[PDB]
Design an enzyme around this catalytic site. Sequence first.
Site, PDB file in Angstrom:
ATOM      1  CG  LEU A   1      -2.044  -1.066   1.270  1.00 21.63           C
ATOM      2  CD1 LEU A   1      -2.848  -0.946   2.539  1.00 21.63           C
ATOM      3  CD2 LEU A   1      -2.973  -1.019   0.067  1.00 21.63           C
TER       4      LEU A   1
ATOM      5  CB  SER B   1       7.359   1.752   1.616  1.00 24.60           C
ATOM      6  OG  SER B   1       8.344   2.320   0.771  1.00 24.60           O
ATOM      7  N   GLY B   2       7.826   4.378   3.391  1.00 29.48           N
ATOM      8  CA  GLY B   2       8.482   5.660   3.635  1.00 29.48           C
ATOM      9  C   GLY B   2       9.212   5.679   4.958  1.00 29.48           C
TER      10      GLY B   2
ATOM     11  N   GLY C   1       8.187   2.851   7.391  1.00 27.44           N
ATOM     12  CA  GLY C   1       8.429   1.440   7.092  1.00 27.44           C
ATOM     13  C   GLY C   1       7.653   1.012   5.859  1.00 27.44           C
ATOM     14  CB  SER C   2       7.227  -1.890   3.965  1.00 29.93           C
ATOM     15  OG  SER C   2       8.510  -1.394   3.638  1.00 29.93           O
TER      16      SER C   2
ATOM     17  CE  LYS D   1       4.365   1.691  10.500  1.00 34.60           C
ATOM     18  NZ  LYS D   1       3.883   2.996  11.021  1.00 34.60           N
TER      19      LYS D   1
ATOM     20  CG  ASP E   1      -3.125   9.459   1.885  1.00 38.39           C
ATOM     21  OD1 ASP E   1      -3.299  10.507   1.243  1.00 38.39           O
ATOM     22  OD2 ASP E   1      -2.081   8.791   1.802  1.00 38.39           O
TER      23      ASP E   1
ATOM     24  CG  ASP F   1       4.238  13.167  11.306  1.00 43.72           C
ATOM     25  OD1 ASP F   1       4.265  14.351  10.898  1.00 43.72           O
ATOM     26  OD2 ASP F   1       4.607  12.194  10.609  1.00 43.72           O
TER      27      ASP F   1
HETATM   28  N1  LIG Z   1      -0.913   3.066  12.627  1.00 43.44           N
HETATM   29  C1  LIG Z   1      -0.749   2.963  11.314  1.00 43.44           C
HETATM   30  C2  LIG Z   1      -1.789   2.773  10.423  1.00 43.44           C
HETATM   31  C3  LIG Z   1      -1.185   2.722   9.180  1.00 43.44           C
HETATM   32  C4  LIG Z   1      -1.810   2.536   7.864  1.00 43.44           C
HETATM   33  C5  LIG Z   1      -1.235   3.048   6.701  1.00 43.44           C
HETATM   34  C6  LIG Z   1      -1.845   2.856   5.473  1.00 43.44           C
HETATM   35  C7  LIG Z   1      -3.046   2.165   5.398  1.00 43.44           C
HETATM   36 CL1  LIG Z   1      -3.796   1.945   3.851  1.00 43.44          CL
HETATM   37  C8  LIG Z   1      -3.626   1.656   6.558  1.00 43.44           C
HETATM   38 CL2  LIG Z   1      -5.126   0.789   6.509  1.00 43.44          CL
HETATM   39  C9  LIG Z   1      -3.015   1.843   7.780  1.00 43.44           C
HETATM   40  N2  LIG Z   1       0.139   2.878   9.386  1.00 43.44           N
HETATM   41  N3  LIG Z   1       0.434   3.033  10.711  1.00 43.44           N
END
Ligand SMILES: Nc1cc(-c2ccc(Cl)c(Cl)c2)[nH]n1
Length: 273
Positions: free
Chosen positions: A12, A14-15, A18-19, A35, A96, A135
């Site tokens: 989905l 990364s940055g 993390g991934s 994640k 987002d 953030d």
């Molecule tokens: N607490 C978190 C939540 C996320 C996250 C990032 C991207 C997506 Cl698409 C989702 Cl469903 C969750 N990253 N860190």
Amino acid sequence: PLESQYQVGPLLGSGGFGSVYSGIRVSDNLPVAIKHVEKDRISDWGELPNGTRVPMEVVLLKKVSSGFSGVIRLLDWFERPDSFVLILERPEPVQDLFDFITERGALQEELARSFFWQVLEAVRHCHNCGVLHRDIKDENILIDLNRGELKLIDFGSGALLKDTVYTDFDGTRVYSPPEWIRYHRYHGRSAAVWSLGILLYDMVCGDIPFEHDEEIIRGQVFFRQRVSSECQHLIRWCLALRPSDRPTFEEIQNHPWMQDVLLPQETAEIHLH
Ligand SMILES: Nc1cc(-c2ccc(Cl)c(Cl)c2)[nH]n1
């Protein structure tokens, strides 16, 4: 184990964080986000009520992950030899706020009001749980497009909330307050209000107000789009140079611009569907 419990889908994003992969929990087909964070990249460590050494992100997510849907929920976590794996809830369809604003431009004030109100409720939940996000920005806000509900993500730069000064910061510089830029010192709540001012300006103007440190320090707000006087007033209040001149969360939510907020479902019906 984790590998059998979850079906891995596509990446989905990364940055700095993390991934993150799309996934499905094999037991009930529940949509999840997986994640991965490398151990060598984790600077802030903490401990759970029991005392296990985990990334601060896991500590903060557990403190906020209960009932209220304004924060993305941590469903489970796993420790690998060189990384930590976090299982997060995943709304579907989702977008987002950064992508949303990029595609649609400056938001109508009725939509920005609904979105901003929900971010305020989510941030208040974090603070009530003893968590400081650090953030708050468009990239860290997910929109549940069907329900019109916003969710805070990425607690990777966060900290336990305290009443004393913070002398460390690893969030987004363009959302950081003048006291951090100038003195490398800030207080949690008033720094969060500054970032909320940046976010509100971003919602109603389609871009952030300041790019350089000099602009942050000057704190002169120029409106590039047509924005109501009440909204401009609230933005300028959140963006007060002196931390003590900023509104409290109560003062933001009692502001004349914040009255008559739409419910999330009404928001999705009018603006998202
Ligand atoms: N607490 C978190 C939540 C996320 C996250 C990032 C991207 C997506 Cl698409 C989702 Cl469903 C969750 N990253 N860190």
